[PDB]
């Protein structure tokens, strides 16, 4: 079916010094890897996909992040966990925001593909690990992730595993993290039950309206209004 494919020509294009040919060969992978089958892409294509995951140019990295959900879909959940989970996590810590932003959207698409129970097992912890990062740019990623993930994780996982972290980060030294707690609570709120909302969310937001910082105040007040509290 594809045992006469000139795969050597493709590999030269993936490892090419010219950036444009790297990007153009990545655009093929989606269709090519399907026709080439699980075994051949795993043995013949995957070592080059892994290289490109950490390419010097961020736009090449971005294209791999966008191809990731299809590649995981083809390769199945069991193999993803052993070779590809690390790639996806290392992206959330990337120096370039655009790469951080896209690795977040990626987590969402993977959860839709593999389901919420798998997310609890293999994703949620690694995301929460970042909440203790010395860098505010990284600590914020945790919240951006929680925003995106709470949708597809359902009420319970959100309440038990994601919510306590958000509430803890309300006491962060950095205001940017603090107002992003207010924004997160506005986003994840409608998913939680009213008891949880009235008892655990409402007191935190009210304390956040007493914050020194103007932006924390505003977004805290805005969350209270939106969630009707």
């Amino acid at each position: 079916s594809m045992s006469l494919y000139p795969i050597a020509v493709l590999i030269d294009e993936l490892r090419n010094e010219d950036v444009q040919l790297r990007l153009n060969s990545i655009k093929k992978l989606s269709t090519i890897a399907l026709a080439l089958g699980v075994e051949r892409t795993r043995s013949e294509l995957l070592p080059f996909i892994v290289e490109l995951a950490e390419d010097a140019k961020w736009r090449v990295r971005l294209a791999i992040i966008e191809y990731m959900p299809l590649l995981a879909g083809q390769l199945g959940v069991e193999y993803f966990d052993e070779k590809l989970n690390s790639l996806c996590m290392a992206w959330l810590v990337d120096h370039v925001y655009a790469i951080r932003e896209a690795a977040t959207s990626n987590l969402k698409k993977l959860v839709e593909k593999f389901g919420k129970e798998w997310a609890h097992a293999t994703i949620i912890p690694k995301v929460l690990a970042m909440s203790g990062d010395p860098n505010y740019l990284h600590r914020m990623t945790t919240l951006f992730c929680i925003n995106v993930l709470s949708e597809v994780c359902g009420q319970d996982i959100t309440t038990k595993h994601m919510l306590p972290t958000v509430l803890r980060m309300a006491g962060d030294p950095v205001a940017n993290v603090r107002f992003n707690v207010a924004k997160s609570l506005q986003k994840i709120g409608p998913i939680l039950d009213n008891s949880t909302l009235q008892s655990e969310v409402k007191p935190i937001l009210e304390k956040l309206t007493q914050d020194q910082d103007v932006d924390v105040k505003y977004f805290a007040q805005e969350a209270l209004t939106v969630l009707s509290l």
């Binding site: 961020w58 736009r59 120096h95 370039v96 925001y97 655009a98 951080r100 010395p134 860098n135 505010y136 740019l137 914020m140 030294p173 950095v174 205001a175 940017n176 107002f179 992003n180 910082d213 103007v214 932006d215």
Partner: protein
Amino acid sequence: KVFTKELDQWIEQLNECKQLSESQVKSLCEKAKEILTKESNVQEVRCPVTVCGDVHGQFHDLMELFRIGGKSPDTNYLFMGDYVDRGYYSVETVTLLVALKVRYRERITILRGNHESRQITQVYGFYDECLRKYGNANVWKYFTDLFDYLPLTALVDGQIFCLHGGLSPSIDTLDHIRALDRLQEVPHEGPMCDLLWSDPDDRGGWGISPRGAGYTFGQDISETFNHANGLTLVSRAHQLVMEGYNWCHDRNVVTIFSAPNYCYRCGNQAAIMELDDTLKYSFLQFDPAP
């Protein structure tokens, strides 16, 4: 607020690279002046924050910058001037940075560069651009009047000194700078002039600037000023850098330039400096938008 909705859509509108109307621009500058008046000559800035250099009207490259370092207000920014002139989009570029200031005054600091004046904006394009995009000189009025209010310098965590140009033989301390009256057109000579015009160079002591304005200063002057004011670093812009950022004077001074491939000619990288929660510096180099 009724005016926060308005501001929010302006920011949204400007991110699509669409200019505000003359009427809108007028209101924006009026409310910006109120905020800027309360700002000190040496404006107090708290880390964490990202320090940027020259943009010279390259709006799409400014968008690339926010793709690299994160968008406002999530990421704290500090700009060291030269927003206008030379590029196609001085209006959109400067309108957005001003918009964001009025919206999140604690999340951004915008400093005055030498290009932020009535004299120079009539030499290098900003006047022309306004006239062509608005049909009259009014927008140029509202902006050049606003430029008089931009703080001359900034101080992050009391330890990192930020300004466009460089040091002045007339200024020994940060108090001399606070004493100054900044609320005027950038003068032809003197301390205010030097802060926005000066350059470091490779020979010792002071030197009259080849630019015809300001002075050039050597490593010993940098060493004296830093030590005397308890500073670890002078962060500045005002000069093209092939690598985006350039160390000099034994790491007493850093030059940051944020206009990649300057004049479609130079093929330089642009850079920004991220300052940690703990004031540690790191640099991000980037090329232009594709």
